[PDB]
């Protein structure tokens, strides 16, 4: 649809900047998530990571400078460039600027996914956003990041 | 740079790795995945040390010595608590799943994993769970494979892919079920697969030929010798036990053949322990053969030579300099004929003229890899001598190396270099009759006859310099390819021109010399190398003499009634019927040889000469350097009836008994004095190894390690009374353990690599001033040549275009690696590896003959209609039939010769 | 005796049109062979190596490295049940026992009629919706051991 609308191709809305987008569906190994091993798997090789400090920003995929970014980083950048920078610094009074897709999972009453600003404690998320846990559970432990 | 290890200041290189800098200082850091010739990866974590930035620090950080650059201001520590217990944990993790089969392992006392397990000091086992097992694979007749012993250090695939360029072995597996090998079962088609025995620190890839008739490393009597299979002259360490040669090891030499051998030189030692070898002086009288000792055989041979009127000494390129000169002194100097064809001798003389009179520096094997472009003219480098082809592979990778170095990344991390490179290759232009194994990395491959390759070289030389003679009839697309070649060569800082005498024509050598002169005339740092046929063919050319055909005419005419053939088959260098008739017409034939050849029949006397495992001698490289090989064992230690004396010893005693009627068992350095006092061109060979009266700190050098076993029961099956150790007056070596193999000894030639705590082939790093570089206290062999001030002239003789004809067929050489040498094909292990004798036809030629692939056709040479099955070759040209040189019944003289009557059998 | 169909060659060549290096399309070529034939046979490695130009060792290593590139023959329906920790808390041992009692096999093996092949999977990315599984690129969440025979009867 973006290619049909004149974007994501050659001379995007009369700029001369040429960009082409592709989707590479991997077969699946958890080590492919790391950036150097993602680069190695993108080149059709086994997904072994690479040593540092030869960085991907200097020599990545096929010896060319590359940048690997998460989905949420590239979902947060267009809101930054569309709404401003001072607005992005003025949504949460914490050292980590911006919003994060947080949420609890595992025998919870409402295990879901909600976008919340940084500095929000896990307790309020668990008791109101997750709604607490189910009947007969005492919440003996938790893990901030997934596994 | 200045670093501080263990609270002690050291001065190491700045751009190298910390692991190699610490190993160059004699310190001990265990390692599994780093190799000096393969770069550094992180497949293990064995080289861990503790690094500090400031002069004083408490915690530090556990880093890898092969990933840390040896920069100015690093304060690393090795034998602290944390790094030592981490290395102990890593060797514990390697012994987590390792089979309990050390005494039934081919490595045993040659295993790096044992050395680094003992060095870390880990004996108590806390692992109680099950181990990991794998199946096995059949990797041909050379490399025995078993996967249980592996530690996943990735050195095998790193060598086999990045260094050797092989497209067979690789990594197939997962987290713990990681496999190293081939997707199917079959022979490794790479010509460098035999270096996996020493590349692998474990017993995964082992020597099958040494697995049969196996002995341990400490039981091996070693010697420093030279490989006699082709002209590259790689320094080897043959090692024997119980009177038979058992294993050839790679001998380190930083100028030629640093770390890797080829398959032919590694596995073609099966001819010296054949049971049909001449072990006695056998003389035939009447119609039956009698066996003599040395004394009365020498007396009888001298009597028959005295009764003769003229003696013809036919040398061989396989024989040493000392033996050929001993023949040249036994017979007259005016009549001494080199055992090669007239065309072969002309090509060898032209190659020597280019080498020592062309004014162009000839690179050694190590410094071929530092050149910026390679042009190979008419030479199957990957099949004649493959070590230059491996160095060409490294020179091709040099472009990726220098492009990575332009990005300010270190040179010891090969992963980043191959990351930056990405199939970026230096210009490699190979010309041959058919496809080569270098075509995978070559910038261009030219499939054409020998005359067309020579004309291509003449076109390259004319485009590089207009003073060269022009060649006409060049097609515009071929002219564009010439333009591409010359603009790649003109932009190269250090171009290289490779040729050889195996092409079968003089004009290819002339074209290579013309291109080298054109590159030198414009100020480039051009090098030129020529791959000769046999191990000491260039020494035979330097000594010189008549061709074999001149000797055959002399024998057929009747001017000489006595012929002495030294270590020559005589059927590879001339036609069989003519040689047989000439030898039958001669009233006296003496054959001084170590192999049962076809000329021993109807030969009046056979002298049991000694092979390179049983003789001392000097061989001259294709580069031009003169190295010398030493004896491994005394053949009379077991089965004392046999003598098996050296060829030069036999001929010199024959000459002495001819003159003074007395037998003189002389000494090797006397023969060296003779060759440096008689031949001024050979005056430099008394600098490779010193005199026999050379003892460092008073004592000699040991053939065998200090733990030589069974010294009082090795010969007890025939005599409990232990014989005296064989006294060696020829060399600086004693035959038993009381010599010296200390790494810090003032010497250039090392029998074997053994250090306390280092029982592996990775113990060679203690014998070098810097690891992975040159050998300490110099290198074996001296150059014997200097770059001439004034070069040759431009060779005006440009050959014409090869025009095919229907009646006459041109024989195209192929030179299979395992079948183009008599000494290689005499080995029983090469028979299951070598291909069957075939012939090669064009599709158009097969259509005009009406035959299909696999059908026998009969061709007539020397009046013999012999039949061979055909193969369809796409790269071959019309009017040419392809033949494997060096085969049984197919002499290498036929390369460039014509063929008639190509009829279907 | 393996050979490549015309559609396979067109798809593989169009995939190599998307990358600078033809080596980068090896995983997608193996995936195309998997989508057409169900698994990657021995001759397919050499076919992909000959089409792409990379050696067969690299293709074999790529095929044997990634989990969802099957080299052993599988059934017509690959059941891929979650083996991770969130579905462990939500309960995957019950549905594993239900599958083992229904198909009468062990994980990693196929049924005798070739109808199903049971396999654990690292994760499905559907952690918030309870235990999850995939059958023939069809995902299922909020699973119960009682609904396993009902869920398994809609596949051929
Ligand atoms: S087979 Fe040998 S060289 Fe290869 S990874 Fe294993 S231990 Fe290292
Ligand atoms: S490779 Fe070394 S450690 Fe392994 S079984 Fe052989 S001798 Fe023992
Ligand atoms: S390249 Fe030649 S000299 Fe070197 S090991 Fe091989 S056969 Fe021997
Ligand atoms: S030697 Fe293997 S990590 Fe350095
Ligand atoms: S843990 Fe099962 S879907 Fe992620
Ligand atoms: Ca001797």
Annotate B736-752 with three-state secondary structure. Answer: CCCCCCCCCCCCCCCCC
- Discontinuities in chain C with C to N beyond 2.5 Å fall right after none
B44 lines ligand 4 (CB under 6 A): yes
Whether residue B819 contacts residue B380, with contact meaning beta carbons closer than 8 Å, is answered with no
For the record, the structure tokens of B34 come out as: 């780093």
Residue C85 CB partners (closer than 8 Å, separation 6+)? A147
Rounded Cα distance between B660 and B250, Å, is 44
When CB atoms are compared, the residue of A29, A43, A112 closest to C66 is A29
Phi and psi, residue C28, nearest 5°: -75, -30
Expressed in angstroms, the distance from the first to the final Cα of chain A is: 36
Q: C-chain residues within 8 Å CB-CB of A112?
A: 128
| CB pair distance less than 8 Å for C64 and B168 | no
Q: Collect all residues from B whose CB is shorter than 8 A from any CB in C.
A: 161, 167-174, 179, 182-184, 422-423
Q: HSE-up of B425 (CA within 13 Å, CB side)?
A: 18
Phi and psi, residue B417, nearest 5°: -65, -45
Q: Which ligand is nearest to the CA of B104?
A: 2
For the record, the structure tokens of A44 come out as: 């059709």
Tokens 């059958």, located at residue: C135
Rounded Cα distance between C134 and B124, Å, is 47
The Å distance, Cα B105 to ligand 2 centre, comes to 6
Our CA-based measurement puts residue B422 at a distance from the nearest CA of chain C, in whole angstroms, of 9
- Among candidate residues B162, B152, B151, the one with its CA nearest the CA of residue B39: B162
**Sheet architecture: strand order including B143-145:** B138-139, B143-145, B205-207
**Helices and strands per DSSP (H, E), number in chain A:** 4, 2
Residue B390 CB partners (closer than 8 Å, separation 6+)? B163, B164, B165, B192, B260, B262
Question: Which regions of A36-131 does DSSP assign to beta strands (E)?
Answer: 99-102, 114-117
| Ramachandran category for residue B241: left, alpha or beta (phi over 0 → left; psi -120 to 50 → alpha) | beta
Phi and psi, residue B755, nearest 5°: -130, 155
Contacting subunits of B (3+ beta carbon pairs below 8 A): A, C
Whether residue C53 contacts residue C22, with contact meaning beta carbons closer than 8 Å, is answered with yes
Rounded Cα distance between B296 and A88, Å, is 107
Rounded Cα distance between A122 and A142, Å, is 10
- Alpha carbon B126 to its chain centroid, in Å, reads 46
| DSSP-assigned letters across all residues of B381-439 | HHHH-HHHHHHHHHHHHHHHHHHHHHTT--SS-HHHHHHHHSS----EEEEESS--TTT
| Ligand 2 nearest atom to the CA of residue B105, by list position | 6
Phi and psi, residue B551, nearest 5°: -65, -35
* Strand pairing report for B244-250 and B235-241: antiparallel
For B830, the domain range is: 808-904
Pocket test residue of B34, B90, B201 for ligand 4, highest count of atoms within 8 A of CB: B34
Whether residue B270 contacts residue B828, with contact meaning beta carbons closer than 8 Å, is answered with yes
For the record, the structure tokens of A17 come out as: 């900047």
| CB pair distance less than 8 Å for A54 and B409 | yes
* Strand pairing report for C133-135 and B61-64: unpaired
What are the distances in angstroms from CA B693 to CA B404, B728, B740? Answer: 50, 11, 15
For the record, the structure tokens of B609 come out as: 């000469």
- Among candidate residues C14, C50, C53, the one with its CA nearest the CA of residue C32: C14
Rounded Cα distance between B433 and B882, Å, is 9
- Per-residue three-class SS string for B813-840: ECCCCCCCCHHHHCCCCCCCCCCCCCEE
When CB atoms are compared, the residue of B161, B170, B174 closest to C60 is B170
For the record, the structure tokens of B30 come out as: 């265990």
* Strand pairing report for B205-207 and B143-145: antiparallel
| Ligand 3 nearest atom to the CA of residue B227, by list position | 8
For the record, the structure tokens of A36 come out as: 């150097």
Give, as one character, the DSSP assignment of residue B658.
Answer: H
Our CA-based measurement puts residue C30 at a distance from the nearest CA of chain B, in whole angstroms, of 15
Rounded Cα distance between C23 and C29, Å, is 10
Expressed in angstroms, the distance from the first to the final Cα of chain B is: 73
| Ligand 5 nearest atom to the CA of residue C87, by list position | 2
| CB pair distance less than 8 Å for B419 and A59 | yes
Rounded Cα distance between B5 and B50, Å, is 10
Pairs of residues, one from chain B and one from chain C, whose beta carbons lie less than 8 Å apart: 34
Rounded Cα distance between B666 and B531, Å, is 34
C93 touches chain A (CB under 8 A): no
Pocket test residue of B264, B268, B389, B621 for ligand 3, highest count of atoms within 8 A of CB: B264
For the record, the structure tokens of B537 come out as: 């063919």
3-class DSSP state of B592: strand
Whether residue C81 contacts residue C128, with contact meaning beta carbons closer than 8 Å, is answered with no
- Alpha carbon B48 to its chain centroid, in Å, reads 36
- Among candidate residues B291, B345, B352, the one with its CA nearest the CA of residue B316: B345
| DSSP-assigned letters across all residues of B129-169 | S--------EETTTEEE-STT-----HHHHIIIIIS--SS-
For the record, the structure tokens of C35 come out as: 């989508």
| CB pair distance less than 8 Å for A50 and B409 | no
For the record, the structure tokens of B883 come out as: 């033949």
For the record, the structure tokens of B305 come out as: 């030579």
B114 lines ligand 2 (CB under 6 A): yes
Q: CATH number for the domain including B826? A: 2.40.40.20
When CB atoms are compared, the residue of B171, B407, B419 closest to A50 is B419
CATH second-level architecture of C77-152? 3-Layer(aba) Sandwich (3.40)
Rounded Cα distance between B386 and B369, Å, is 14
**Sheet architecture: strand order including B562-566:** B288-291, B282-285, B605-608, B588-593, B562-566, B311-314, B336-337
| CB pair distance less than 8 Å for B183 and C21 | no
Burial B212-243 (b: 16+ CB within 10 A, else e): eeebbbbbbbbbbbbbbbbbbbbbbbbbbbeb
Tokens 């950080």, located at residue: B61
Rounded Cα distance between B868 and B855, Å, is 8
Tokens 């080299």, located at residue: C71
Tokens 């009549």, located at residue: B335
- Other CB atoms within a 10 A radius of the CB of residue C20 amount to 13
Tokens 């080199």, located at residue: B338
- Per-residue three-class SS string for B555-586: HHHCCCCEEEEECCCCCCCCCHHHHHHHHHHC
- Among candidate residues A68, C56, A50, the one with its CA nearest the CA of residue B417: A50
- Alpha carbon B721 to its chain centroid, in Å, reads 41
């Amino acid at each position: 649809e973006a290619t049909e609308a004149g974007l994501l191709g050659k001379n995007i809305m009369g700029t001369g900047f040429d960009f082409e987008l592709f989707v590479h569906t991997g077969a699946g190994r958890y080590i492919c998530g790391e950036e150097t091993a993602l680069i190695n798997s993108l080149e059709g090789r086994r997904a072994n990571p690479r040593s540092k400090p030869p960085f991907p920003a200097t020599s990545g995929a096929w010896g060319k400078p590359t940048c690997v970014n998460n989905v949420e980083t590239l979902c947060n950048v267009p809101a930054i460039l569309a709404n401003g920078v001072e607005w992005y610094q003025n949504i949460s009074k914490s050292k980590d600027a911006g919003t994060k897709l947080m949420g609890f999972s595992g025998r919870v009453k409402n295990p879901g996914l909600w976008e919340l600003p940084f500095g929000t404690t896990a307790r309020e998320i668990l008791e109101d956003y997750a709604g607490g846990m189910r009947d007969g559970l005492k919440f003996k432990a938790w893990q901030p990041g997934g596994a | 740079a200045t670093i501080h290890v263990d609270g002690k200041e050291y001065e190491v290189n700045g751009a190298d790795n910390l692991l190699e800098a610490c190993l160059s200082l004699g310190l001990d850091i265990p390692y599994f995945c780093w190799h000096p010739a393969l770069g550094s990866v992180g497949a293990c974590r064995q080289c861990a040390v503790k690094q500090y930035q400031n002069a004083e620090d408490t915690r530090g950080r556990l880093v890898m010595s092969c990933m840390t650059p040896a920069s100015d201001g690093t304060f690393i520590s090795i034998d602290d608590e944390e790094a030592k217990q981490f290395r102990e944990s890593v060797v514990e993790w390697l012994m987590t799943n390792h089979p309990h089969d050390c005494p039934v392992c081919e490595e045993g006392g040659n295993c790096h994993l044992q050395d680094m397990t003992v060095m870390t000091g880990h004996s108590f086992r806390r692992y109680r769970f099950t181990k990991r097992t794998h199946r096995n694979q059949d990797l041909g007749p050379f490399i025995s494979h078993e996967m249980n012993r592996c530690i996943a250090c990735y050195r095998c695939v790193r060598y086999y892919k990045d260094y050797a360029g092989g497209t067979d072995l690789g990594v197939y597996g997962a987290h713990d079920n990681v496999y190293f090998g081939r997707p199917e079962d079959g022979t490794l088609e790479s010509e460098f697969s035999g270096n996996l025995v020493e590349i692998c620190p474990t017993g995964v890839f082992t020597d099958k030929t040494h697995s049969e008739r196996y002995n341990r490393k400490w039981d091996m009597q070693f010697a420093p010798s030279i490989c006699q299979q082709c002209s590259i002259g790689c320094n080897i360490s043959p090692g024997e036990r119980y009177g038979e040669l058992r294993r050839i090891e790679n001998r380190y030499n930083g100028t030629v053949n640093h770390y890797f051998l080829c398959d032919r030189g590694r596995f073609g030692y099966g001819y010296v322990n054949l049971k049909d070898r001449p072990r006695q002086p056998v003389q035939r009288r009447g119609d039956d053969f009698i066996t003599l000792n040395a004394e009365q055989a020498m007396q009888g041979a001298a009597d028959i030579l005295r009764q003769s009127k003229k003696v013809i000494g036919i040398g061989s390129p396989r024989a040493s300099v000392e033996s050929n000169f001993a023949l040249r002194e036994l017979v007259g100097e005016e009549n001494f004929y080199t055992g090669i064809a007239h065309g072969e001798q002309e090509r060898l003389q032209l190659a020597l003229k280019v080498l020592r009179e062309g004014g162009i520096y000839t690179p050694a094997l190590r410094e071929i890899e530092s050149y910026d472009a390679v042009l190979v003219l008419g030479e199957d480098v990957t099949q004649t001598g493959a070590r230059v082809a491996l160095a060409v592979r490294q020179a091709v990778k040099g472009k990726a190396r220098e492009m990575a170095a332009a990005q300010k990344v270190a040179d010891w991390q090969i992963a980043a270099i191959l990351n930056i490179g990405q199939r970026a290759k230096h210009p490699l232009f190979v010309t041959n009759v058919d496809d080569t194994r270098l075509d995978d990395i070559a910038a261009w491959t030219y499939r054409a006859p020998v005359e067309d390759q020579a004309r291509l070289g003449f076109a390259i030389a004319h485009a590089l310099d207009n003073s060269a003679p022009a060649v006409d009839g060049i097609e515009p697309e071929l002219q564009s390819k010439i333009d591409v070649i010359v603009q790649a060569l003109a932009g190269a800082k250090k171009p290289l021109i490779i040729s050889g005498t195996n092409a079968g024509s003089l004009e290819v050598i002339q074209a290579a010399a013309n291109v080298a002169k054109a590159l030198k005339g414009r100020g480039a740092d051009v090098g030129i190398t020529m791959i000769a046929r046999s191990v000491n063919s260039m020494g035979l050319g330097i000594m010189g003499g008549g061709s074999l055909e001149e000797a055959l005419t002399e024998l057929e005419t009747g001017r000489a009634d006595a012929v002495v053939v030294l270590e020559n088959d005589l059927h590879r260098h001339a036609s069989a019927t003519r040689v047989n008739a000439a030898l039958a017409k001669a009233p006296l034939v003496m054959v001084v040889d170590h192999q049962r050849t076809a000329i021993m029949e109807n030969a009046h006397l056979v002298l049991s000469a000694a092979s390179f495992a049983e003789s001392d001698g000097t061989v001259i490289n294709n580069e031009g350097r003169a190295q010398r090989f030493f004896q491994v064992y005394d053949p009379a230690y077991y089965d004392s009836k046999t003598v098996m004396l050296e060829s030069w010893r036999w001929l010199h005693s024959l000459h002495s008994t001819l003159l003074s009627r007395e037998v003189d068992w002389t000494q090797l350095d006397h023969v060296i004095d003779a060759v440096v006092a008689k031949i001024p061109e050979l005056a430099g060979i008394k600098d490779a190894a010193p005199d026999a009266t050379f003892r460092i700190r008073g004592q000699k050098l040991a053939r065998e390690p200090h733990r030589y076993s069974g010294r009082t029961a090795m010969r007890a099956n025939i005599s409990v009374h232990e014989p005296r150790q064989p006294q060696d007056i020829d060399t600086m070596f004693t035959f038993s353990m009381e010599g010296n193999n200390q790494p810090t000894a003032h010497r250039s030639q090392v029998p074997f690599a053994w250090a306390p705590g280092w029982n592996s082939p990775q113990a060679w790093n203690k014998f070098q001033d810097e690891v992975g570089g040159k050998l300490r206290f110099g290198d074996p062999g001296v150059r014997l040549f200097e770059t001439s001030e004034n070069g040759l002239d431009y060779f005006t003789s440009v050959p014409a275009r090869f025009q095919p004809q229907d009646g006459k067929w041109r024989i195209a050489p192929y030179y299979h690696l395992f079948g183009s040498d008599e000494l290689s094909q005499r080995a029983p292990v090469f028979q299951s590896r070598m291909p069957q004798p075939y012939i090669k036809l064009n599709p158009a030629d097969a259509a005009k003959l009406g035959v299909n692939a696999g059908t026998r056709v009969s061709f007539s040479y020397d009046g013999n209609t012999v039949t061979l099955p055909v193969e369809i070759a796409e790269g071959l040209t019309a009017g040419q039939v392809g033949l494997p040189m060096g085969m049984s019944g197919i002499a290498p003289v036929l390369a460039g010769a014509h063929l008639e009557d190509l009829k279907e059998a | 005796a393996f050979e490549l169909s015309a559609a396979e060659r067109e798809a593989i060549e169009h995939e190599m049109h998307h990358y600078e290096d033809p080596r980068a399309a090896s995983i997608e070529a193996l995936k195309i062979v998997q989508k057409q034939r169900g698994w990657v046979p021995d001759g397919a490695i050499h076919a992909i190596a000959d089409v792409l130009g990379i050696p067969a060792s690299d293709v074999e290593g790529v095929a044997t490295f990634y989990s969802q590139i099957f080299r052993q023959p599988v059934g017509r329906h690959v059941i891929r049940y979650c083996d991770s920790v969130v579905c462990h808390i939500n309960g995957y041992q019950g549905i594993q026992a239900a599958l083992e009692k229904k198909l009468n096999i062990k994980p990693g093996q196929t049924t005798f009629d070739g109808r199903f092949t049971l396999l654990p999977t690292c994760c499905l990315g559907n952690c918030d919706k309870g235990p999850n599984m995939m059958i023939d690129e069809d995902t299922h969440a909020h699973l119960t051991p009682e609904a396993i025979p009902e869920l398994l009867e809609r596949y051929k």
